Design a protein around this ligand. Structure first.
Ligand SMILES: Nc1ccn([C@@H]2O[C@H](COP(=O)(O)OP(=O)(O)OP(=O)(O)O)[C@@H](O)[C@H]2O)c(=O)n1
Ligand SMILES: [Mg+2]
Ligand SMILES: [Mg+2]
Length: 431
């Protein structure tokens, strides 16, 4: 059964004649442009090992340079070989297109093996060398892994996904031999599982760690979040229990009507709202970590102010960002208890009592307390206040945007914004 499912899964993960066509054209051409210049380079991507997922074609070329320091020559070479170009940020590289195919031209040292100068980009060539000879023949196993992860939103080590990188997928296929064996054993991974590829061993450690065979101190699964690891383990246990081709297919967007959402929310009886603001002009890897931090600070504020947040989420559209929240408390009393000093402190007590208040302070369990008034009674009002004077804690660029402008939105108005998918997921809505 399973083998039959994996067989049909291949038709979803293995590229196609018309994209294996573009990659074969752009490659020859790129070599021609690189050779004429007499450049030293090496293709090192998923493309270079035919392990790239269907529809995800892209080429990675690393230019090799000695022991000198400013490879602004790369800026030069790339621009001179790529039909179109862009500078993506020791991180600046050329990204463009050649014969229609996306290409990355990156600056590294033709290092006579492991040492890596201010390593990062310099490791990429060894990663390729280490894999090239071990992955041969299992290309499609890698593809099944990638396709499986992707269909479930966990392929990609970028901050927006915090999932499994392509490289991590190839080390795993190499360690276990195949996609199936990988999932079968991933059913027993724990948050303390250490997969040491170079030593062919699995042990227990401090956190989930997949030792890079090229550099033992590096955790290849550094960006995989604890929760996406958990989801993969659970997915594996589910697939083996009942394999289905559906695990290799994107789930379909819960086409939900605003009136059905209003009904779910009034039925849950919670306060559902979002903070809307202009999306700052920064790259995803910079934006997402700020959206996560801004969402956590606001959640912590809601917890502290006793609005009992249930869950939060965020969304980045083309022009705006949204921080979504759901709280168990829609309204809290205007009066609250303010803690005073122990009865023994004559001086501080006199001070605590000198303040004018609508009600009389009192002693309880040896300490003075006073009833005082809150400056807001709903989580929406609480957040309007917080976002107005504590935007500095919400990330450098996200906070600056909120400082210029933001609005708290709820109800139908909220349902009209492009955040319905996030809302449904946040509340666990099902079809
Ligand atoms: N040690 C490294 C460092 C970087 N890359 C590059 O980092 C990006 C991740 O790619 P890879 O790990 O090869 O997998 P994907 O490119 O995601 O492959 P696919 O989209 O086809 O699934 C790629 O452009 C790849 O060229 C790599 O392969 N190995
Ligand atoms: Mg690639
Ligand atoms: Mg790339």
């Amino acid at each position: 059964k399973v083998e039959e499912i994996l067989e049909k899964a291949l038709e979803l993960v293995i590229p196609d004649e018309e994209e294996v066509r573009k990659g074969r054209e752009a490659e020859e051409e790129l070599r021609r442009r690189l050779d004429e210049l007499g450049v030293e380079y090496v293709f090192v991507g998923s493309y270079a090992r035919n392990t790239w997922l269907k529809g995800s074609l892209e080429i990675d070329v690393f230019l090799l340079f000695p022991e000198e320091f400013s490879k602004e020559e790369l800026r030069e070479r790339g621009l001179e070989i790529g039909k179109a170009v862009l500078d993506s940020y020791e991180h600046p590289y050329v990204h463009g297109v050649v014969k229609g195919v996306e290409v990355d031209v990156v600056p590294c040292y033709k290092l006579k093996e492991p040492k890596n100068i201010k390593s990062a980009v310099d490791r990429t060539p060894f990663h390729h060398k280490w894999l090239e000879g071990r992955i041969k023949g299992k290309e499609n196993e890698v593809r099944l892994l990638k396709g499986f992860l992707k269909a479930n939103g966990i392929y990609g080590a970028e901050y927006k996904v915090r999932g499994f990188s392509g490289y991590l997928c190839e080390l795993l296929i190499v360690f276990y031999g195949s996609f199936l064996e990988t999932v079968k054993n991933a059913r027993r991974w724990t948050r303390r599982t250490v997969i040491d590829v170079a030593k062919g061993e699995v042990r227990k450690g401090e956190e989930f760690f997949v030792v890079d065979p090229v550099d033992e101190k590096r955790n290849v699964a550094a960006n995989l979040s604890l929760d996406n690891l958990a989801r993969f383990v659970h997915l594996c246990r589910e697939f083996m229990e009942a394999p289905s081709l559906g695990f290799f297919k994107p789930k379909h967007p819960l086409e939900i009507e605003p009136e059905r959402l209003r009904k779910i929310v009034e039925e849950r009886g919670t306060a559902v709202f979002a903070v809307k603001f202009r999306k700052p002009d920064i790259v995803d890897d910079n934006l997402y970590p700020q959206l996560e931090r801004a969402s956590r600070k606001i959640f912590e504020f809601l917890e502290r102010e006793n609005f009992m947040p249930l869950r939060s989420a965020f969304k980045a559209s083309e022009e705006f960002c949204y921080l979504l929240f759901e709280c168990q408390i829609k309204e809290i009393s205007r009066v609250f208890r303010r803690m005073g000093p122990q009865f023994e402190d004559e001086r501080n007590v006199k001070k605590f009592l000198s303040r004018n208040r609508a009600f009389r302070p009192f002693i309880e369990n040896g300490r003075w307390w006073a009833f005082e008034m809150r400056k807001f009674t709903t989580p929406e009002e609480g957040v309007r206040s917080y976002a107005s004077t504590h935007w500095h804690t919400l990330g450098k660029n996200v906070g600056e945007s909120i400082r210029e402008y933001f609005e708290i939105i709820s109800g139908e108005k909220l349902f009209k914004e492009p955040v319905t998918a996030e809302l449904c997921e946040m509340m666990g809505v099902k079809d």
